[PDB]
Each structure stands twice: as structure tokens, then as C-alpha cells.
RNA sequence: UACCUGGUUGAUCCUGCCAGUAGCAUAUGCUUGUCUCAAAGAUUAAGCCAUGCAUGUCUAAGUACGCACGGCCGGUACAGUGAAACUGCGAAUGGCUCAUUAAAUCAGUUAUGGUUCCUUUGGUCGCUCGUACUUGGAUAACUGUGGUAAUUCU
RNA sequence: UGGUGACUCUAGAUAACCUCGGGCCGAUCGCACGCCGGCGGCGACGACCCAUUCGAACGUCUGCCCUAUCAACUUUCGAUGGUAGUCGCCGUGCCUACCAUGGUGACCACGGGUGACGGGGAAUCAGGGUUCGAUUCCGGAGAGGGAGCCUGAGAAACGGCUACCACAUCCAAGGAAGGCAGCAGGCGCGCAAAUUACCCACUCCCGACCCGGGGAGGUAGUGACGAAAAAUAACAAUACAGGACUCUUUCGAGGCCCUGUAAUUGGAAUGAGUCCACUUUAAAUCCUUUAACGAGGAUCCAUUGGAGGGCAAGUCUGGUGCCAGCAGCCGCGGUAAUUCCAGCUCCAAUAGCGUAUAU
RNA sequence: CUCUCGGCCGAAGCGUUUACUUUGAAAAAA
């Protein structure tokens, strides 16, 4: 394996029930490493499953030697679902956001503003 | 209101007299000797040296035991020594006024790449740096105007991924080898 | 403007928060509370910018709403709650106590204290007055009101408050020769022994203070916070003991530390 | 970089201005490969505006007999989720613009011992010598009847 | 009782008042469960009052552009002060009634003008200055123009109301409804300025609130305002030229150096571009990172101004002939025009350069 | 001198005043 994972900064955040760290990925001849295999490498590195690992913000340095990102390893998947941002859970398939747009919601709200009572639910 | 910063600064100054034969000749000599793209590179290095001289002059008007003179002169001299423009022996603010533009021009990455034998000419040095063939320590540097520090001078190598420094022949060589 | 303001621009925020300029347009406007807006550190800045326990304001809220953060012995869920000088921040989940104490640069240091020290705090009494049929009352810089204080306690003294019960357990008078910190002005965060108090009736009294290294400065009386009787503090001090090195000595110390490594 | 040059005369030395010279800021013209920042209906018209959006809000903890979903068929009032509506809070912040405005605004400096202050925080809250194991009437939501061409009308 | 430099302060005592438009002294909600009818733990919410915080308001001292073709102004239409009150949150001609006759001014009052919001600041600048500051931070003001209010702690609020003035929408003609100097967008104006886009992920704000909302804000789109970095080639051989104490002249000591019309010859090297997978990010884009293709007129083509002087660069060729034009200024043009119109060449800056205007 | 002098410590004074000069406070950020 020619791709290396190191964790410079690291702290056990007991307040948010996780460990948080900065991840260096050495990949001299490859593209920026996909988040999933960084997650499995971190899972081997910290003896846990890759479903409680959330990596993000990976920037590859000019030249191509290495990529630096941030990573969280939660105590359980339940703490991960409780504390993680909804988009980072959606990247794992654990969350789905509203399929409506801001425009549709705003105009529906302003339309409901024109009716009084139970008829508000009978709008749109 | 925006979360943006508008701190920006012009890095050169245009000469007062546009068509002056002596200045045109001096600038063209610098351009040709150091492989510069245009007159703005000369004017940029001139502006850098001018600001350094202005700071040194303003420090030389303070008392020799002035805390600010001591602190900021020491910092300025340390900065000039760090990039090799000043020698460690001349750690006085009076020696700043004796510095030339060529002193700063030697410390460009292009000049050092040419002078360390990595390139056949200063123009070859510039095109080598612009084509991601050169690295300082482990960082592939791509900017010809990169001012080499004193302790970065011995770490200018030929890039571990360039065809000249570690393999993977280039587009042309691979295509020609495929052809025959 | 009509009525009160509710926002704080990031660049109009106090500089000792050490907020950068590109994160956003706004700074967390401190809530009203014990300490003034410019003399406080909001809980979000402490838990996110200083301790790095959170990356965003959402995570600061997530921490605070689990009731993990105590300020002066009480759980606070307001992430912009104004925590100020001498305030004790307890995080029992991680088992760490801090006391908000100024640096020699005028910034609130991350100063960790023992759980025994986290039981009390020093408070500079702001005023003494009689009310409620002869009952004496005392008001501190922390804005806590204490009934029946010791008759010897006067304005500008320092009392020790047991956070569990919130009553005075000891006090230092404002006397020449007592250790004090500076809580405002150019000398903010400096610790030294009070040398003399020049009184200006109808104006601001000036207090002269001498460092432990022999450096003498002066502040207004409103900026003086008596710390200990004599030259012995009643609280733990940060790594810098209130001695403000000049920039030359800071440079020398940094260079010596750097050259000792490698 | 503490800098000048051309032009009055047949020629000269001046006064002296015109012109040149460099930046800066708007507009405009020609041209424009890469990449990072980044201003942008101020100037004339604080002129006029189609349309859409820009301020809403619920916790274990004010009021749930909307079957709208939903159970454990009961001296079991109220399981729970919960539209609506009442109540509370916000809407006086933010954003925009520079018309007004010449000790006015504003800046530094002081004062409020001449005032008000939601909220936050701390204190006070059996300190009053004179159906309570909980008092009264309404009104929303909801049901039902309607008016006007027309409204977030009622 | 305590405090202040200073109270007609704070606290105390007495005699009473104690507002129907009447003030405090809890008829509230959740969780956990208990204890030989009683006693309870942890909270949520609410109400005086006093501090505190956030302020607001009103005063102090000093500081503001041009103007004398503005030299006197104000004076119970309160002007300056006094006394008493009214009103106001409070000090006060804030207003009222009596009383006095004051108050400001060449140290520039008063009046007028301002293509005048003030400041932090910006441009330029040897020293000194000059000009600018509508503009993201602070303070003020306004919401078409005035005026008046309701609610509220806080508004004389305008994404609140009431009226008038101007403009204007629907109408079944009876009535009803308006306020983009918010974000986009349109018209108009002009020399002069962008999308009717995406999102609350960030920064923060608001709410009963860990959960909702935010055209604040963030993200993209347009963008040569402006600023930073930085390609448009590099190298070698060949023929040629030049020097190199080359012999006090002709390739018999002239290739361990250097230059160029070289549409000469060669290989190398590349990213502009296209495209793939990551990465980025709410989601994307961009940058970075792989990979694939991608350069020899490397036609993958650099322009904008100029060539008399000032002022860098041709009295070269053709045309025109005081015409057309150039020319900031001096001047050029009337048949050899170094100045016009063109070709060639050159040179100034260069992804930028010219012009107008203000400074 | 210091109308408090006590067997090294403090109630020890803009001592007509101002301008000036040198301090020291206090004075947003950008």
C-alpha cells in the first residue's frame, strides 16, 4: 500500500463523544484519495468500524504529494447520528433532506398566510 | 457587509521619465542577464529594495539605543540575511543602503536553478520552473520569482516526478517510443 | 437607532477575542450578564476558538445543551453567555476546570485550575450600601449581591466567594503592598504589588504598581483588582506570572526555545 | 528618486504662462491565453416600480375532546404525535440609501449627585396581625348559517 | 447605620395619605419519586422591588468647508436671565404667567452657498502640504412629501396605523387596496454600474426554541473597477558572424566561448485546451490531485500607441500636393512631406495599451 | 517648616499661575 495515513493533531472530545484529528494522506502518484478508503484506513488505524468515521475537507497540496483533511471517529453510530451535521450523515446515506426548494417553501408559506384556520393545511 | 478582505497592494512603481536611454539600457541589461519577462519584474524588485531602504533610513534617524530602532533593525537585518541578500558579517543598518537590485535578483529561484547547474541558461531555468520540474525541499515550486532563502538553497532538486528527476518520460518521448 | 442592538460585527468585536476577519460578517454578540460586553469572553469563543472542542457554533450549542458546561458552579446553556474575569468554567465530563484570567497581552488565557481551586472565586466589591431596614449589601464586579458582608469590607477590596454557597469566606483590603492584577487599560493583565494610590477628588484615582521583576506602571483605580494579601496570590496565575516582557525579551526567549530543539 | 523639458527673439538673459511628465479615480476605445483576490445603479432621478421572495417562532415543562394519525375496552379525566387557534416572545435588530443636516451631525473628553432601562445575572419575594384538596364569566380553534364584484373583509 | 470631593444620599423615627384609569405579597406547568392526614427533591414559567448588563436620552470642554457683492443679529411669533408653576423619564424658556433688559458679534455674529451626512480613513506627498471620503466599521438621518399617533421596555416604526399632498392599482362605479433609499428584476435618467440564480452548510440573529426561520449572511452567475502571480517557447547540431596578448595581414596554433534573418535539421519539455475519477461543497462550480489525448509556420499567430523635437524609435519606398489630414505645444502639408494616407523596418509598455474628464 | 511628632515608617506642600518641554494615564476595530 503506497497510500499513507497520519494524524497530526488529535483530541478525545468527550463532550461530543468522538475523537477529532487532522489527517495527512500521502499519495505520490495517485489522485486525491477517495474519502471511503481513507475511512477504512482510519478504521484499521484506530480499531473500529468505518461507519463511525466521518472525514471531510481534504485539500491536496500543490505538486501532488499529500492531502490534508479533518476526521471524526465517534464512539457509536448513535452518537454519530446525534452529533454529526446532517450533510455529513447524508454523504454516508444516513440522512435525506427535503426535496422542496427554498422558493417553493417560501411561496407556500406566503400563500398559507392568506388563509385562516384549518384551511391553511388545504393549501398547495 | 461581506466577509471579504480588500487589503490589496501594488508591488511596483512606474518610472517618472518614460523614455530615458540610460534607464532603458540598465533595465534591459537586467532583464537579459536574469531572464525576466518584462520591465515590471525589474520595477518590482526595485520597489522591494526601495521600501527596504526607506525602512533602513527611517531606522537610522532614531537613537542608536532606541528600543524600536534596535528591534526593527535587527528584524530587517535578519530578514535580509535569511534570503542571502546581506552577509552575516554586515549586520548594521548602514550596510542596507549599500545593497543593489542585482543582490535581490540573484536570490530568485530562476537564478539559483541556472546557477546550480540544473539548467543550461537562465531562460531554460525559467521554463524548467514553469513546467513543474523544480522542487525546493519536497515542495514542487512553480514560481520563477520565488526568493530562495539561505537554508533552502541546498534543497533545490529536480522533482521526483519530472522526467529529469525520477522517471515517467514525458508526452513527447512516450509518443515517439510508441511510434517506433 | 430604536431600541437595543442585537448584532455584533466581527471587526467591531473586542480585539482580545482574537477573532479573524474572513470567517464571517458577525461576531457572537455576548448576552447581557454579569460582565460587560467588552470585558467578557462568550462561551462560544471559549469552547470553539480557545479549546477547539467544537468546530462550529452548532457544535458549541450541542455541547452547551447537554448541560456539560458550568460557569461559577451553575450550568449555562447560553452559548453567548458572558464569562469574565475570575469566572470559573467547569466541564465535569472531561474533568477540567478553568479560571478566566487575563494574559500579559490582555487576553483571556486558557488557565486550567485544580478542582479544589474551582470551588471559589475572587470578586472585587463594586459598592457597599445599606438598604432594607439597616441590612448592609455588597455588590461585586461579578454583579452578585451579598447581604450582611463583614463590616470591614469596603469598596475596591477583594472578597473570596465560595461558589457552592456564594458567601464571603475571606477578604483582602485595598492596601499598599498587596498583590493586584490590572483588568483594563494599557497594563491589562499585569500583576504586581500596589506601591501608592494618588487620589484625585472628583476625578480618577491613579494606582501605581510594581512588578515582581521591578517594573513600575500605573493604572486607574477602576482597573485594579487585588489578588492576594502581600505578594502571595490567592489564585493560580497563568504560565506568565503577570510579568510583561518587552518585545526584545520575547524575541530572545522565542529564539532560545527554538534553538533548544533539533 | 528633494528631477524637470518644448514654446515669445534675428539672437540673448528673464518674468510668465501654455504644453509636455508620473500617479490616482470614473467613463470609453482597441485587445485579451492561465490563475488568485476582488469593486460594482453613489454621481444624473431620496425618480417610478410589474412579479416573486426578504420575520417569524414550541419545549419534559401555558391552553389539545381536530380520529388528522394513533393504543392496552376502561373508577382509564388527560397514552402519544399533532394541523388549527388562543396565550407568550420577536417584529425598534439586520439590510438599504445619503435627501436633509454648517457647533447641527460627528470626534475625542467628561457628567448624569438631573433620567429611563425588555432581557441577562445576583439579591429580595410566612418581614404586612387582617372554596383554598383550587374560585368566575367569556372567547377562539371546531360545527353550522351567511353577505359583498372585490381584500390576510368579516 | 454606611457612603461621597461634594446630597436635599443611604438607612432610621414620627404624623398621616395610599389614585375605581387599585401596587407587591404565586389559585401555573413538567420530571423523579418518596418518608410515621402531614413533611419533601430537581426544575420550567410569572410578579413586584434593588443592583448588574445592554443601552437610550440629555448636558460639559475643544475642534468643521466657501462667502462681507452678508455688519450688525435676537427681542415676550421667548429673544437673555429671575421667580412660581405646567408638561416631560428627568435638568432646562421645554412651555406659561409675572419681573428684569438682556444675550451674540471683525477673535467674523447674523445671512447666504455647498455636484456638504460626520468620523475612522483614501490618493498623492523630501520636509511642509493639496485633494478626496455616497461606499461594507462607528455615530446620525430617512423610508414618495409633510403631519399625527397605536402597541410596546424600546418606534413619532412606515416589509405598523390614520389623514392630507403627488403619483398610482382593481372595480360589477357601490367601494377596495398602495409605498423596492431590502434581495433580484423592469422603466426612466444618463458618460456611467451585475442574476427576477442556489442555500441556511458557514458567521451570527430571532423564537416557546439542541429541532423552526433568516434575499442578514454565505455560494455560485455577469465582471479588463482594481490588485497579486504568471505562458506565448527552451535546448543541440549544422552553415555564418563576432571577439578570445592568435602569429607587428592569406580557413599551417580560426569549434574547454557567444549571436542571429536561419519558411535549416533534430529530438526532448510542457500547459492552454478536451475529457475521466477523486477531491472540493448543503449540492455544485473553481483551484489542487490522477489518468487519457493535446506543439514546429510549436497557424495553440499579442496587442495598443508611436517613429521631427519635447520623448525611445527611419530625412526608407509609394501616394497626396496648404488638399486630405496630422499636430496636447512648437510645428508638418503649397511636387525630393524624416510629421499626412499606406508598405517595410524600428521601439515603448505588454495581457495590456490609448483617449476624455476630475484630482 | 510641615498649628500629631511618635523609640527606619506616615495627613509631607499644582504651594500665586499659565504657556512650553518631558512624563504617566486614558483613548474601538479595520
Swiss-Prot record, chain A:
Q: What Pfam families does this protein's entry cite?
A: Ribosomal_S24e
One MF term in GO for this entry? structural constituent of ribosome
> Keyword set for this entry?
Acetylation, Cytoplasm, Diamond-Blackfan anemia, Isopeptide bond, Nucleus, Phosphoprotein, Ribonucleoprotein, Ribosomal protein, Ubl conjugation
Spell out the subcellular localization from the entry.
Cytoplasm; Nucleus, Nucleolus
Instruction: Enumerate the residue ranges of region (Disordered).
Output: 90-124
Q: What is the annotated tissue distribution of the protein whose record heads this document? A: Mature tissues, such as adult brain, skeletal muscle, heart, and kidney, express low levels, whereas tissues and organs with significant populations of proliferating cells, such as fetal brain, placenta, bone marrow, and various glandular organs, contain significantly higher levels.
Q: Name one GO biological process term.
A: translation
Location of Phosphothreonine modifications: 7
> Spans of biased composition, class Basic residues?
99-117
Q: Where is this cross-link: Glycyl lysine isopeptide (Lys-Gly) (interchain with G-Cter in SUMO2)?
A: 35
Question: What cellular component terms from Gene Ontology apply here?
Answer: cytoplasm; cytosol; cytosolic ribosome; cytosolic small ribosomal subunit; endoplasmic reticulum; membrane; nucleolus; nucleoplasm
The UniProt entry's sequence similarity note says:
Belongs to the eukaryotic ribosomal protein eS24 family.
Q: Which HAMAP family match?
A: Ribosomal_eS24 (MF_00545)
What does the record give as the function of this protein? Component of the small ribosomal subunit. The ribosome is a large ribonucleoprotein complex responsible for the synthesis of proteins in the cell. Required for processing of pre-rRNA and maturation of 40S ribosomal subunits. Part of the small subunit (SSU) processome, first precursor of the small eukaryotic ribosomal subunit.
> Which proteins does it associate with, and in what oligomeric form?
Component of the small ribosomal subunit. Part of the small subunit (SSU) processome, composed of more than 70 proteins and the RNA chaperone small nucleolar RNA (snoRNA) U3.
What the entry lists under PANTHER family is as follows: 40S RIBOSOMAL PROTEIN S24 (PTHR10496)
Put simply, this protein is called Small ribosomal subunit protein eS24
Species, as recorded: Homo sapiens
Curated annotation (Swiss-Prot), chain B:
Q: Where in the cell is it found?
A: Cytoplasm; Nucleus, Nucleolus
Q: Which residues carry this modification: Phosphoserine?
A: 152, 162
Q: Which GO terms describe its biological process?
A: cytoplasmic translation; positive regulation of cell population proliferation; ribosomal small subunit biogenesis; translation
Query: What keywords are annotated for this sequence in UniProt?
Result: Acetylation, Cytoplasm, Isopeptide bond, Nucleus, Phosphoprotein, Ribonucleoprotein, Ribosomal protein, RNA-binding, rRNA-binding, Ubl conjugation
Q: Which GO terms describe its cellular component?
A: cytoplasm; cytosol; cytosolic ribosome; cytosolic small ribosomal subunit; extracellular exosome; focal adhesion; membrane; nucleolus
Record domain S4 RNA-binding: where: 107-180
Top-level taxon:
Eukaryota
Q: Which CDD domains match?
A: S4
Q: Name one GO molecular function term.
A: translation regulator activity
Q: State the SMART domains in the record.
A: Ribosomal_S4 (SM01390), S4 (SM00363)
Disordered, as annotated region: 161-180
Q: What Gene3D superfamilies does the record point to?
A: RNA-binding S4 domain (3.10.290.10)
Q: Which Pfam families match?
A: Ribosomal_S4, S4
Q: What does this protein do?
A: Component of the small ribosomal subunit. The ribosome is a large ribonucleoprotein complex responsible for the synthesis of proteins in the cell. Part of the small subunit (SSU) processome, first precursor of the small eukaryotic ribosomal subunit. During the assembly of the SSU processome in the nucleolus, many ribosome biogenesis factors, an RNA chaperone and ribosomal proteins associate with the nascent pre-rRNA and work in concert to generate RNA folding, modifications, rearrangements and cleavage as well as targeted degradation of pre-ribosomal RNA by the RNA exosome.
Complex formation: Component of the small ribosomal subunit. Identified in a IGF2BP1-dependent mRNP granule complex containing untranslated mRNAs. Part of the small subunit (SSU) processome, composed of more than 70 proteins and the RNA chaperone small nucleolar RNA (snoRNA) U3.
Q: What is this protein called?
A: Small ribosomal subunit protein uS4
Instruction: Supply the source organism for this entry.
Output: Homo sapiens (Human)
- Give the gene name: RPS9
From Swiss-Prot, chain C:
Query: S4 RNA-binding domain: from which residue to which, for each copy?
Result: 41-103
Which family does the record claim for this protein?
A: Belongs to the eukaryotic ribosomal protein eS4 family.
Where does this one sit in the cell?
Answer: Cytoplasm; Nucleus, Nucleolus
* InterPro entries hit by this protein: KOW, Rib_uL2_dom2, Ribosomal_eS4, Ribosomal_eS4_C, Ribosomal_eS4_central_region, Ribosomal_eS4_central_sf, Ribosomal_eS4_KOW, Ribosomal_eS4_N
Q: Could you confirm whether the keyword Ligase appears in this record?
A: no
Keyword set includes Ubl conjugation: yes
Q: What does this protein do?
A: Component of the small ribosomal subunit. The ribosome is a large ribonucleoprotein complex responsible for the synthesis of proteins in the cell. Part of the small subunit (SSU) processome, first precursor of the small eukaryotic ribosomal subunit. During the assembly of the SSU processome in the nucleolus, many ribosome biogenesis factors, an RNA chaperone and ribosomal proteins associate with the nascent pre-rRNA and work in concert to generate RNA folding, modifications, rearrangements and cleavage as well as targeted degradation of pre-ribosomal RNA by the RNA exosome.
Q: Which gene encodes it?
A: RPS4X
Q: Which CDD domains match?
A: KOW_RPS4, S4
**Site of covalent link Glycyl lysine isopeptide (Lys-Gly) (interchain with G-Cter in SUMO2):** 229
Give one GO molecular function term. Answer: RNA binding
Kindly provide the name given to this protein in its UniProt entry.
Answer: Small ribosomal subunit protein eS4, X isoform
| Predominant cellular place of this UniProt entry's protein | cytoplasm
Instruction: Describe the protein's quaternary organization and the partners it interacts with.
Output: Component of the small ribosomal subunit. Part of the small subunit (SSU) processome, composed of more than 70 proteins and the RNA chaperone small nucleolar RNA (snoRNA) U3. Identified in a IGF2BP1-dependent mRNP granule complex containing untranslated mRNAs.
What keywords were assigned to this record?
Answer: Acetylation, Cytoplasm, Isopeptide bond, Nucleus, Ribonucleoprotein, Ribosomal protein, RNA-binding, rRNA-binding, Ubl conjugation
Amino acid at each position: 500500500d503506497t497510500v499513507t495515513i497520519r494524524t497530526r493533531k488529535f483530541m478525545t472530545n468527550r463532550l461530543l463523544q468522538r475523537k477529532q484529528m487532522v489527517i495527512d494522506v500521502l499519495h505520490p502518484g495517485k489522485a486525491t484519495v477517495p474519502k471511503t478508503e481513507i475511512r477504512e484506513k482510519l478504521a484499521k488505524m484506530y480499531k473500529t468500524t468505518p461507519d463511525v468515521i466521518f472525514v471531510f475537507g481534504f485539500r491536496t497540496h500543490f505538486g501532488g504529494g499529500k492531502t490534508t483533511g479533518f476526521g471524526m471517529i465517534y464512539d457509536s453510530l448513535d452518537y454519530a447520528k446525534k452529533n454529526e451535521p446532517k450533510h455529513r450523515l447524508a454523504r454516508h446515506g444516513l440522512y435525506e433532506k427535503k426535496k422542496t426548494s427554498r422558493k417553493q417553501r417560501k411561496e407556500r408559506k406566503n400563500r398559507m398566510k392568506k388563509v385562516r384556520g384549518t384551511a391553511k393545511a388545504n393549501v398547495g | 457587509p461581506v466577509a471579504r478582505s480588500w487589503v490589496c497592494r501594488k508591488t511596483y512603481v512606474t518610472p517618472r521619465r518614460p523614455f530615458e536611454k540610460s534607464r532603458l539600457d540598465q533595465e534591459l541589461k537586467l532583464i537579459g542577464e536574469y531572464g525576466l519577462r518584462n520591465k515590471r519584474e525589474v520595477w518590482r524588485v526595485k520597489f522591494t529594495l526601495a521600501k527596504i531602504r526607506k525602512a533602513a533610513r527611517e531606522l537610522l534617524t532614531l537613537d542608536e539605543k532606541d528600543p524600536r530602532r534596535l528591534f526593527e533593525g535587527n528584524a530587517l537585518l535578519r530578514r535580509l540575511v535569511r534570503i542571502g541578500v546581506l552577509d552575516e558579517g554586515k549586520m548594521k543598518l548602514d550596510y542596507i543602503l549599500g545593497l543593489k537590485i542585482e543582490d535581490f535578483l540573484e536570490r530568485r529561484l530562476q537564478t539559483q536553478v541556472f546557477k546550480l547547474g540544473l539548467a543550461k541558461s537562465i531562460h531554460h531555468a525559467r521554463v524548467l520552473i514553469r513546467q513543474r520540474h523544480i522542487r525546493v525541499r519536497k515542495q514542487v515550486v512553480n514560481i520563477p520569482s520565488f526568493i530562495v532563502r539561505l537554508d533552502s538553497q541546498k534543497h533545490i532538486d529536480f522533482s521526483l516526478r519530472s522526467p529529469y528527476g525520477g522517471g515517467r518520460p514525458g508526452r513527447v518521448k512516450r509518443k515517439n517510443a510508441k511510434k517506433g | 437607532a430604536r431600541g437595543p442592538k442585537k448584532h455584533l460585527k466581527r471587526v467591531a468585536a473586542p480585539k482580545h477575542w482574537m477573532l479573524d476577519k474572513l470567517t464571517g460578517v458577525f461576531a457572537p454578540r455576548p448576552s447581557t450578564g454579569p460582565h460587560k460586553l467588552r470585558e467578557c469572553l462568550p462561551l462560544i469563543i471559549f469552547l470553539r476558538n480557545r479549546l477547539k472542542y467544537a468546530l462550529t457554533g452548532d457544535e458549541v450549542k450541542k455541547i452547551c445543551m447537554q448541560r456539560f458546561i458550568k460557569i461559577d458552579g451553575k450550568v449555562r446553556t447560553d452559548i453567548t453567555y458572558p464569562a469574565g474575569f475570575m469566572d470559573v468554567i467547569s466541564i465535569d465530563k472531561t474533568g477540567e476546570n478553568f479560571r478566566l484570567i487575563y494574559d500579559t497581552k490582555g487576553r483571556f488565557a486558557v488557565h486550567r485550575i485544580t478542582p479544589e481551586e474551582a470551588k471559589y472565586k475572587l470578586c472585587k466589591v463594586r459598592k457597599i450600601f445599606v438598604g432594607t431596614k439597616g441590612i448592609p449589601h455588597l455588590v461585586t464586579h461579578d454583579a452578585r449581591t451579598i447581604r450582611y458582608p463583614d463590616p470591614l469590607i469596603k469598596v475596591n477590596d477583594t472578597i473570596q466567594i465560595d461558589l457552592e454557597t456564594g458567601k464571603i469566606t475571606d477578604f483582602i483590603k485595598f492596601d499598599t503592598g498587596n498583590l493586584c492584577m490590572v483588568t483594563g487599560g494599557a497594563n491589562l493583565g499585569r500583576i504586581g504589588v500596589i506601591t501608592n494610590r494618588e487620589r484625585h477628588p472628583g476625578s480618577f484615582d491613579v494606582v501605581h504598581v510594581k512588578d515582581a521583576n521591578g517594573n513600575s506602571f500605573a493604572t486607574r483605580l477602576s482597573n485594579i483588582f487585588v489578588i492576594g494579601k502581600g505578594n502571595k496570590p490567592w489564585i493560580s496565575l497563568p504560565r506568565g506570572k503577570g510579568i510583561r516582557l518587552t518585545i526584545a525579551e520575547e524575541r530572545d526567549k522565542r529564539l532560545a526555545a527554538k534553538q533548544s530543539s533539533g
